[PDB]
Structures are given as C-alpha cells and as structure tokens.
Design an enzyme around this catalytic site. Structure first.
Site, PDB file in Angstrom:
ATOM      1  N   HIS A  41       1.872  -2.648   4.620  1.00 19.02           N
ATOM      2  CA  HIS A  41       1.406  -1.513   3.832  1.00 19.02           C
ATOM      3  C   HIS A  41       0.070  -2.308   3.117  1.00 19.02           C
ATOM      4  O   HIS A  41      -0.523  -1.556   2.110  1.00 19.02           O
ATOM      5  CB  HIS A  41       2.192  -1.103   2.785  1.00 19.02           C
ATOM      6  CG  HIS A  41       2.829  -2.085   1.698  1.00 19.02           C
ATOM      7  ND1 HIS A  41       1.846  -2.432   0.890  1.00 19.02           N
ATOM      8  CD2 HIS A  41       4.060  -2.477   1.399  1.00 19.02           C
ATOM      9  CE1 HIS A  41       2.818  -3.288  -0.064  1.00 19.02           C
ATOM     10  NE2 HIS A  41       4.051  -3.053   0.308  1.00 19.02           N
ATOM     11  N   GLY A 143       1.984  -6.610  -7.551  1.00 21.88           N
ATOM     12  CA  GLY A 143       1.409  -7.937  -6.949  1.00 21.88           C
ATOM     13  C   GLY A 143       2.526  -8.879  -6.659  1.00 21.88           C
ATOM     14  O   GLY A 143       2.068  -9.996  -5.774  1.00 21.88           O
ATOM     15  N   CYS A 145       4.708  -8.162  -3.932  1.00 22.92           N
ATOM     16  CA  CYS A 145       4.735  -7.909  -2.675  1.00 22.92           C
ATOM     17  C   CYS A 145       4.562  -9.043  -1.654  1.00 22.92           C
ATOM     18  O   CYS A 145       3.563  -9.809  -1.899  1.00 22.92           O
ATOM     19  CB  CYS A 145       4.081  -6.633  -2.146  1.00 22.92           C
ATOM     20  SG  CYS A 145       4.573  -4.902  -2.936  1.00 22.92           S
TER      21      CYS A 145
HETATM   22  N1  LIG Z   1       3.978  -3.609  -5.808  1.00 23.88           N
HETATM   23  C1  LIG Z   1       5.248  -3.643  -6.567  1.00 23.88           C
HETATM   24  C2  LIG Z   1       6.585  -4.157  -6.025  1.00 23.88           C
HETATM   25  N2  LIG Z   1       7.565  -4.222  -6.786  1.00 23.88           N
HETATM   26  C3  LIG Z   1       7.463  -3.961  -8.129  1.00 23.88           C
HETATM   27  C4  LIG Z   1       6.446  -3.416  -8.735  1.00 23.88           C
HETATM   28 BR1  LIG Z   1       6.581  -2.932 -10.612  1.00 23.88          BR
HETATM   29  C5  LIG Z   1       5.370  -3.163  -8.043  1.00 23.88           C
END
Ligand SMILES: Nc1cncc(Br)c1
Ligand SMILES: Nc1cncc(Br)c1
Ligand SMILES: [Cl-]
Ligand code: NA
Lengths: 305, 301
Positions: A41, A143, A145
C-alpha cells in the site's frame, strides 16, 4: 530471580531496516539479500486507498519511483513485484548485514518481538502476542508501517510479521513476510474492525508456572480437575479451549514445579470464579496471557543468542 | 495508538558485550574502544565473599589472569585498573562496533533498557526503572552480572547501569559505569536489605496523561487539589512525594491534553481511594509507574 516482558535482542533485525519512499508516502522496508520487502500500500494515494487495484497501480510505476535509503546511502532499485500484500523491490546490492533467516507464519497465541521503526530508523522493541482474533496490541504511530515482528531460534531470525494498519479500536493488523494477512483484513480504506477477543489459556497457565518458579504461590490449592470440566469454565469466561497438546507442552513446567497442568487449571478455575481478592501475581492484578510456555522456560533458564 | 512497555533497540549494545573470565568465575563485560568494563567482584573467590579486600586481590593479578572473549575471538588484556566497583581492562583491540556513547548516572524514577546477557551473548531486552529505594525489578539469573542498562538518545548510547547482585527480596542492585553503586549497597555478601519501596508518583501521572492522549477519560473528576494536600494523601498510599520539579516536568503533557497537573493529581487521589471498579487503564488493573514523562512524549502523540 524476576520475570519481565522480554523481547529478543533486536540487533540482527536493525541491520535490515531501510526507508522506502513512493511519491509522498514514506515507510519502512526489510532489506534481506538483494530484496527490500514492504507493504504494497506504499504505492497508493489517499484516493487510491478507498478502492485500490494494486497491479494497475504498480504497472504505472518505474524502478526509479521507489526511493530506498539504508542509513544515509541510497539503494538502486532494479526490479519490483508483488507477492500477496507485500511489495518486493529487487535492489542492486545484497545486504551485507543479512542474518540467517526464515519466513514463518505464526499461530494465534504465539509471541514475537516487534521492532518499531520510523523513516527506516528503529526506535523501540517490545514483545507482542498474536491474539486469537489475529490482531496484535502494538504501539504504532504514523510512519510505522513496514516494521517487522520476529523470533530468534539459535542464530536464525524467524520473520513472522509486517505491520500494515491500525484498526479503529487501536489494535493492529499485518501480514506475514509472504504478504498473507493475519485475520480477515484487507489493505484498503473500508469499514474494518477486530472481532471479539479471547484469552490465551495455555499462556496464562505458563505465566502461573512462571509465578510459582518466582515464589508467588498464594493461588495454589489442593484441587485438580479434568480437561472437559475446565473447558466448560474456559468457555464461560471467554478463554480459549485447552487442548491435550497444550497440556503436553506445559509438561516440563509441571514436572519442574510439581504442579500438574490440571492441578494448575484448578487454580485458574478458582481465579476466574473468585478473582484475586486484592492480591497480585508477578506484580499484576490481571491474568497475563502474552507469555508462551517456551517464553517462560527460556527466561527462567538463560538462553542466549 | 497503543501503549507498550518499550525498550530501546539493543543492537548498539549487543556489539559491545564480551565474556570476562577470572579463575572459575565468568560474567559479562562491556567493550568500549579499547577498555572492557565489568564488575570487580569477578576476582573474588569463595573465601572473598563477605569481606573482600579488592585492592589486595587485584594487586595479585597479572594481565593474563583475565580471559576476555569477544564472540569467538580472544582479546589480549594489556592493562587493568579499578574504579570504585568496576574493573577496567585495557585490551589490545578497539571495538570496531563501538557506538557513540556516554556514561550517565540516573536518579530514582528514571527508566532504561536492560540487555540481559550470559557468557557475553545477549539473552533479551526489557525496560526497567530505578526504584526510589535504588533497586531495580529486573530479570536476572546467575551469570548475568555485567549486563548493562542504557538509553539511546538519538544515536548516542547513554550507559547508566551495570548489574552486580540480587538482594534477598529478589530485586537487583548495581552501579553506574563509573563503578558507584546506586543506593547504600556494597559488593559484599554481607546482609543487605532494600528499603521499603514506594510508587513513583510523577511517573503514574505521566501514564495517566498517556491514557488521555490515547482517548481514555473515565478516571478524571471535576475536582482539583493543592500540591500539599495531594502529597498528604499520596504518602498514605506509599507514593513518593510530588515536588514542584515534577509539576513543571508534567507541563507539556498538561498543555497537550488540557488537564492541569493538579487536576490530574485530584484524579489520582480518587483512583487511590476508589480503585478501578473492574475497569482498566491502558490495559492494566494497576497504576503503572515505570513510564517517565519523557517516555510518554516519545511514545505518544
Ligand atoms: N500508518 C499507521 C500504522 N499504524 C498505526 C498508525 Br496510528 C498509523
Ligand atoms: N549473580 C546473580 C546476579 N543476578 C541474579 C542472580 Br539469581 C545471581
Ligand atoms: Cl536521571
Ligand atoms: Na490445585
């Protein structure tokens, strides 16, 4: 003495984390040999994410649309492809810090260490358990991910989790390193929610054994039970069914402490039906279920890597 | 979202742990540049446990009495000296994996990560805090002496603890990296007991602010309190006194959530009074005191 929520040493995985940028999106990648792994993604705009066609979005991208940085060095992407929900970016240099590793898919109730990263830079490590509803109670911000979960067996890092998304309840969802999601989730902006969770019964029992080993014994009693009778109680209190494989796995702890598993199940029965009466177990007023039997044995024995 | 007891990534420290052997005793050492740091009680025998004279024991040792194994490589010891309760072994090789580092002595309430090690190889990493009684509630087995505690500010490793012994109550005592013990403890097997432990009040308040940041407000109330009335109540629950320093430090979290520090103190007073009544805060049925205000801001928002 002592019992702590303990993560694996994260050094071997820190050396594999890179920053991946596509357009305005930047997240983390896992650099092993000459491939960087990251969530597919990363190629979606905000509008794309409502209804993505990832193959269509990908064919419009060239290798030079994937900015990869390892520390302060840029990596040259020479190829890109998809496996399930992870993007694979072939780069021109093998990672000289690649550890011995495997890609493994774990089961609900099994634990792993999470190396939280931001902009390809590791920021923290903590221990997680895959919940029975296939979520994890992690700690992630925007950020994060591409942060990965892992175990270490001997010298081999077993990569088992890649972070993709946060669910509306604040819990988290991700894939294995082959792109297969844990749980009934999809990578797109749509109505999604975690199912009702349950407690990992074999892990609670393991943690009660850890408590006994550490001198915490007030919950032991004279009674014992049967698997059939305990599992009626477990069902009633939203606990996972205890199988015969769980009893076998707790075998070592049962012999080391002289407390049979069904003997301990009677302790857990009484705790579920009566509470803890103002007392604590290993400094907790809750029944902790994110220690596997292997976790308890390893911490109460001193295994290193 | 979410809130976890979160340690620093241990890789930079992993590259500094070595094995230190002297006689029949083996423990861990910290290899920084061309110096290896380790507890000086590695030179005690079974006779030297209650009243060791460390200067007399050390003067009888030459460099080759110390075996230092870094991974599979033997390091050559070319010098040795004692600083308070740490041994400093000069080695003939500088650690190529030496990170940016410094030695800092921490105050009670401060947190740090512990890299538990055995035979110079890391076993696991977890988060700890210096208790007000100057012990830490760690996870340490025999052979873990020399394991270190640390924070990592940006890319600089702040070494702040080295493990020495376990007290009879199952808690642990150690030194800073200059060899000065935290608290009134000594490296002798003489009877020693940790003082009565107390709850780190400023850390509980920071943790309640963390709960509000992640969207939980059920424990707030319409009341406030003076600083002195709060401390008069809190020490009846064995809570550390809250100082004006602590109130200032909580300033940023108060501004972010819109809850004045003394308003959060009134909420804590009521929690101590009422308990949780079956609810949890950030997944705990107890009030957590091993997150500092600095930790909360680093993990939240
Ligand atoms: N992109 C994202 C992933 N995990 C938690 C959050 Br809050 C944002
Ligand atoms: N030597 C030692 C250190 N920590 C804990 C234990 Br039990 C023993
Ligand atoms: Cl400090
Ligand atoms: Na029993």
């Amino acid at each position: 003495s002592g019992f702590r929520k303990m993560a694996f040493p994260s050094g071997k995985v820190e050396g594999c984390m890179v920053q991946v940028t596509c357009g305005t999106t930047t997240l983390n990648g896992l650099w092993l040999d000459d491939v960087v792994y990251c969530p597919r993604h990363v190629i979606c705009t905000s509008e794309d994410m409502l209804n993505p066609n990832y193959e269509d979005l990908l064919i419009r991208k060239s290798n030079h649309n994937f900015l990869v940085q390892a520390g302060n060095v840029q990596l040259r992407v020479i190829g890109h492809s998809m496996q399930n929900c992870v993007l694979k970016l072939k780069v021109d240099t093998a990672n000289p810090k690649t550890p011995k590793y495997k890609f493994v898919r774990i089961q609900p109730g099994q634990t792993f260490s999470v190396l939280a990263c931001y902009n390809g830079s590791p920021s923290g490590v903590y221990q997680c358990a895959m919940r029975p509803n296939f979520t994890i109670k992690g700690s992630f911000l925007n950020g994060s991910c591409g942060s990965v979960g892992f175990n270490i067996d001997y010298d081999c890092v077993s990569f088992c989790y890649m972070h993709h998304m946060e669910l509306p309840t604040g819990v988290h969802a991700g894939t294995d390193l082959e792109g297969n999601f844990y749980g009934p989730f999809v990578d797109r902006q749509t109505a999604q929610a975690a199912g009702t969770d349950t407690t990992i019964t074999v892990n609670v029992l393991a943690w009660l054994y850890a408590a006994v080993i550490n001198g915490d014994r007030w919950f032991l009693n004279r009674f014992t039970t049967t698997l059939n009778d305990f599992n009626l109680v477990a069902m009633k209190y939203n606990y996972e069914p205890l199988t015969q494989d769980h009893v076998d796995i707790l075998g070592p702890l049962s012999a080391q402490t002289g407390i049979a598993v069904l003997d301990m199940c009677a302790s857990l029965k009484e705790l579920l039906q009566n509470g803890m009466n103002g007392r604590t177990i290993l400094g907790s007023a809750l029944l902790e279920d994110e220690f596997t039997p292997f976790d308890v044995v390893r911490q109460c024995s001193g295994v290193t890597f």
